Amino acid sequence: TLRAAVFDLDGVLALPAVFGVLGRTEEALALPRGLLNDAFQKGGPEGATTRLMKGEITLSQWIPLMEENCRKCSETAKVCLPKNFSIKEIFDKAISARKINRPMLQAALMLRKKGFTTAILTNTWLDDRAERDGLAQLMCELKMHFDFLIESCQVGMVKPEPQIYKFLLDTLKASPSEVVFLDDIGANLKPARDLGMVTILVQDTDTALKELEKVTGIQLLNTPAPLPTSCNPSDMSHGYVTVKPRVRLHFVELGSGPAVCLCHGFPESWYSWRYQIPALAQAGYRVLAMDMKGYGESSAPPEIEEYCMEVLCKEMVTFLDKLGLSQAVFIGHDWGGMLVWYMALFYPERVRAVASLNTPFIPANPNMSPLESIKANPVFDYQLYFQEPGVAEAELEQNLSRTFKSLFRASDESVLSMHKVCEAGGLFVNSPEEPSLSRMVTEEEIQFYVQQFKKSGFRGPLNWYRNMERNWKWACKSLGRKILIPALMVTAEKDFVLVPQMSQHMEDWIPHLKRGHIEDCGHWTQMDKPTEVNQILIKWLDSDAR
Amino acid sequence: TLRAAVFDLDGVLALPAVFGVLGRTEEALALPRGLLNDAFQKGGPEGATTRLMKGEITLSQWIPLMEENCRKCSETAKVCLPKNFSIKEIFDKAISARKINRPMLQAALMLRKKGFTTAILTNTWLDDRAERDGLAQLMCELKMHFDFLIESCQVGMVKPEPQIYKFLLDTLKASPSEVVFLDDIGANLKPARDLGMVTILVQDTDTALKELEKVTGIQLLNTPAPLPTSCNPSDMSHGYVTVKPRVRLHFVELGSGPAVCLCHGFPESWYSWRYQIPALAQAGYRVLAMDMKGYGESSAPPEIEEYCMEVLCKEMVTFLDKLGLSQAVFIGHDWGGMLVWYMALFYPERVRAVASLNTPFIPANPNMSPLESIKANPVFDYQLYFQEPGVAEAELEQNLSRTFKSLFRASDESVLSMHKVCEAGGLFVNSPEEPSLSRMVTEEEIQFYVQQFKKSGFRGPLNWYRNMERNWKWACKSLGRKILIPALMVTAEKDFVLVPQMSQHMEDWIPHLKRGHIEDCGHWTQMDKPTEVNQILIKWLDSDAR
Numbered sequence A, B: 001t002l003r004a005a006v007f008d009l010d011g012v013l014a015l016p017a018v019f020g021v022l023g024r025t026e027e028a029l030a031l032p033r034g035l036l037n038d039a040f041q042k043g044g045p046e047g048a049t050t051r052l053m054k055g056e057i058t059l060s061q062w063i064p065l066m067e068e069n070c071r072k073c074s075e076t077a078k079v080c081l082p083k084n085f086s087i088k089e090i091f092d093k094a095i096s097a098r099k100i101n102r103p104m105l106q107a108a109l110m111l112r113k114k115g116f117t118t119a120i121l122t123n124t125w126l127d128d129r130a131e132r133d134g135l136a137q138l139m140c141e142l143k144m145h146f147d148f149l150i151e152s153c154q155v156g157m158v159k160p161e162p163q164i165y166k167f168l169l170d171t172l173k174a175s176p177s178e179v180v181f182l183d184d185i186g187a188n189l190k191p192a193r194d195l196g197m198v199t200i201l202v203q204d205t206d207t208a209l210k211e212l213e214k215v216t217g218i219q220l221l222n223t224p225a226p227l228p229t230s231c232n233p234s235d236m237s238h239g240y241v242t243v244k245p246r247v248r249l250h251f252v253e254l255g256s257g258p259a260v261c262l263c264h265g266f267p268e269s270w271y272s273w274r275y276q277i278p279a280l281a282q283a284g285y286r287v288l289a290m291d292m293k294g295y296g297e298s299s300a301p302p303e304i305e306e307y308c309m310e311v312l313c314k315e316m317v318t319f320l321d322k323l324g325l326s327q328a329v330f331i332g333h334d335w336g337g338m339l340v341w342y343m344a345l346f347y348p349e350r351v352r353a354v355a356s357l358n359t360p361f362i363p364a365n366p367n368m369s370p371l372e373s374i375k376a377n378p379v380f381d382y383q384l385y386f387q388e389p390g391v392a393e394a395e396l397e398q399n400l401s402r403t404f405k406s407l408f409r410a411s412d413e414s415v416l417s418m419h420k421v422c423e424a425g426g427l428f429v430n431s432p433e434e435p436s437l438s439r440m441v442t443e444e445e446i447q448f449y450v451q452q453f454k455k456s457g458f459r460g461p462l463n464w465y466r467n468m469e470r471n472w473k474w475a476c477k478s479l480g481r482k483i484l485i486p487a488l489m490v491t492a493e494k495d496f497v498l499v500p501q502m503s504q505h506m507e508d509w510i511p512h513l514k515r516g517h518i519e520d521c522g523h524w525t526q527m528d529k530p531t532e533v534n535q536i537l538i539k540w541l542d543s544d545a546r
C-alpha cells in the first residue's frame, strides 16, 4: 500500500526537458547525431557532468569543460562545430524554456491532499549563471508543494548510484514498497525498481498519469479544476508596525516586486485573502495582507472615533512611512474597499493603483444626513442595528463558530434575512443554532476566524460602521476631486447589499475606470470565486500597476 | 526663548524652487515677463491655484485650468504661446529637478538634536500625476526628520491666510514667540511676523543659516560632518518567520527594491546595522536586517549542532522560501560574513550578490584539523576560550553593561589584551569593572544590547564558535568550487584579528572579486566608520547588485 510519490524534475515536473536540447541542437545545426549528447556524458562517473551533478563544481566552471568535450567529440566524428556555438547560450535558453508541467504538479498536489508524502528527487547543478534567478524562481514555485526536495548537487550523490535511493527512502521514513517513483530516464528508474519501489517510465504525461492513478487508485486525470494555493498561517512571514503609541498593525507578507496592500472587510482577517496571497506573489508582487485596525493581531482600541475613515487612512499612510514605502497598490473588499477609495482621494501620491471588490465609489450627498441615506435603502438596515454599542457585539460574540458559519456562505446557501433586522432583533434570529458548513470554507478555516476574534471581539470591527457622520463630513471635502489614478471596480452579481448597479455612475468621478464582473458570486468574493478574482487582479496589476 | 523651527518646502528645504520655473520658462521661450507667473496666480483666493492648494481639486484637474489662464494672459499681453507648450511637461520637469537642500535639512536635524520641535509647513497639492512617485519619495525622505508635516491641501487652509498660522501654533503647542519660521516668500512670512513669530526671509541658504544660528544661538554652519540616520527600534517594521518547529527568525524591514539581507556578527544584533538600514533603503533597496539565530527576538536553541554553518545556511534558505524571495543580496560582518560566503558557495541561485565586512574567504585545509589551524594564530586564542560550554557564558553574562562597553570600542580605545586569553582566565580579566563609554556608542545604544541579551544570553551566540570540526568537514565539500557571482570584500585596517592581509589570496577562489578598504577602522566596522561603509556598499550595490 503506497504512501509516497517521488518525481524527477527534468522531463517529469518540468517541460521541455533540458536533456532533449542537445538532440534539438544537433538537428538544428545539422551535426552528427548524439554528438553533443555524448560530449555531455563524457567520462561517465568521473567526467565533468558527474562532478557538476554531485556539487563538486558549479555550472560556470562546467561550461568550459563541456565545450572541451564538444571539441574532442567533433574530432572523432570528423565534423566541425559552427562559428559561434555557445554551450552557455544553448543552456540559458533551454533552462529558460523549461516550465512547470502543470498536470504533473496537479497530480502531486492531489496525492498530497489524499495523505501522500511527496518529494522531488533530481540530478541538478549549483547554478551561478548571471541568469540563475529564473530557475531559482521555478524551484521556489515547485518545492512549496512537496514534503521534500532532494537535489543531487546538495547531497553529493547522483542517480543512478544506489546510495541516493537509500538516502531517499531514509528521508521518506518508508519501505521501497510504499513508494511510487516517476522518471523519464529508464537507467535512473532501474535502481528504484531493483529495490521493489513502484516505478513509472514517463514519456508523455497523460500515459504516466493513467499509470499513476491505476497504481494509487486515486483519480488524477480529468479531475475538476482545483482551487488556487491557500495559506497556512504558521508558514507566513508576520509583520508588525507601531503607527502610534497605542496602535500596532499586523500584516502577512509574501513575494517581491511592487507593494500590493490587501484591505479586508467586515468582519474579516488578513486570512480572507488566503487564495490571493500566493497567486499575487507568484505573479511578481510583494503582498502585504493586513489585519485591519480592530482585527486579529492588530490593535483594537475601544473608542468609536479611532475607526473613522480619516484616522484609518492616516494610520495606513504612517504604515507606508514606517515600512519605507513611497507607494503601494491598495486592494480593498467591503469596508476595506471603502478605505481604498478614500486613500485614492486623499493620498494619490501614496497609491500606485486602487482596486475595490463589491464596494462602489459613491460621492457623499451634502444635502442629506448619511443616516437618512442609509434609511433610504432597505438592504442597509443591518447598518442601523450596528449603531447602538454592545447590541451587535452581544449577538456576534455569543457563539463565534455560529457567527462565521452563518455569515460565510455562498449566494445559494442563504441563512440570513437582511430585511427588517433591528425589528427582527438581530442578524441570526431566524438562523439555526447549528448552521451547516458552507462549501466555501473548511471547519479548520472557520476555527481560525473563531481563534482570531477571541482576542478583541466585535467592538473595534463594529466601530467601522459607527462613524457615518464623521466620514460624511470628511468625504464632503473631496467633492470637487476626481480619481485619475489607475482604478479597478469589481462587481459580484449576487451581492444583495453591494449590488452591481450601485457602481453604475462611477465613471462620472473615475473616467479611466476599469471593470471586472464576477457571475454567481456573493458578498464573500475572495473565497467564493478565488480563481476569477486572481485572474481579474493579476491581469489588471500587469496592465495598470507596473 | 525659541523651542520650535518651522520650514517651508519649496525654496527652503527643497531646491530649485518649483515657483521659479515659470520665470525660467518665460526667459527660455522669450515670452513677456511674469506672463506665466501671473496666469499661475490668476483669480487670487478664488482662482484655480488656491483651490488646488486647499485640496479642493487635484493637480491633474488643475493642469487644464492653468493652460486656460495661460491663454487669457497671452491675449491681454498680445503674445503667442509656442506650438507644443505643455504645463504638464513644465511641471513634471520642475518637480523632478527639485532636490533636498541638504544644508537646510542638516540645520533642521541639528536643531531637533538640540531639543527643538521641528515642522514643515507647506502650500502643496494632491498629486495624481502618472509620475507622482518621485515627489512621494522626496516627501518620505524629508518628513521622517521632523515632528510635523503640515500640508495646505490636507488641512484645507493656505498661506498667507492666518488660520493656518493659528493651526500651526496649536499643533506645535507653543506661543508665536518660541517659534522661528523660514520662508522664501515675504508675503507668506508676514502673518507669522504679525503674530510675533521670529521669521527669516530665505533667499540664499547660507545667509538664512547665519540668521538662524544668530537667533537660536546654535552653531549650524561649518558644522563637522554628521553621522548617517540611525534607527529607533520602536519605529521599525518587525518581521517573524518560523523556519522550523522550534526556530523563528526575527528581522527589521525597511524600503522597497531588491532584497538585501544583513547578517551581523558576534555578539551583535540587527541593531549593529542601524546606520546602514535607512541609507540602503534610501538608495532603492528592501532591507532585511536579521537577528541571527541565538540572538535578540530570534529563537536561541540550547544545542551546539543547531549553530553549525550547514544548518544556519539551510535555515536562511527556508527564510527566503517562506518570504517568497527567490534571491537576496547577502551582506555579512564577522560570523555573519562567514555565513555569507558559505551561502554563495552552497546556494548561488539564492544569492543575488555576496558582500563581507572584515571576514575573508579562506578555503578549508583538508590536511589540518581546524583546531590545529586556530592554534597556529595567536590572535585566534579567544576562539579556544570559547570552546568549553558555560565558561565564556559566565564571564559574558555576569555584567552585560560591562561586556558591551568593554567590547564595543574603536581601535584607539583598546581595553582588551586578545593575547593568551584562556591563560589570563578570560576576555575582561585586565579590563576595568566600570569601562568608560566609547565614542562609537551612546549609553542608550549600550542598554539596547543589554536588554536584547537578557532574553537568551550568550549560549546560542557562543555556539557559533563551537562547530569548528562540523564546519570544516562541510566546507571541504566545496573545495573544487569557485565563487563566480558578484562579490565584495571590505577590509578594516585596524581589525587586529581579521587583518586585511588575511584576505590577500581571495582572487584565487573569487577572480571577479571587488574590494573596499576602510582606514582607521577597528572590528566594529558598521558603527566605527558608518559613512564610508554606506558609501562602499551603495556604490557596489548600484554597480553589481542591480
Ligand SMILES: CCCCc1nc2[nH]nc(N)c2c2c1CSC(C)(C)C2
Pocket: A266, A267, A334, A382, A407, A414, A415, A416, A417, A418, A427, A495, A496, A497, A498, A523
Ligand atoms: C444574504 C447574506 C448576504 C451576506 C452579506 N452581504 C453583504 N453585502 N454587503 C455587506 N456589507 C454584507 C454583509 C452580509 C452578512 S451580514 C454582514 C457581514 C454584516 C454584512
Ligand SMILES: CCCCc1nc2[nH]nc(N)c2c2c1CSC(C)(C)C2
Pocket: B266, B267, B334, B382, B407, B414, B415, B416, B417, B418, B427, B495, B496, B497, B498, B523
Ligand atoms: C582589541 C579589541 C579588538 C576587538 C575584537 N576584534 C575582533 N576582530 N575579529 C574578531 N572576531 C574580534 C573580536 C573582538 C572583541 S572579543 C570578540 C567579540 C569575541 C571578537
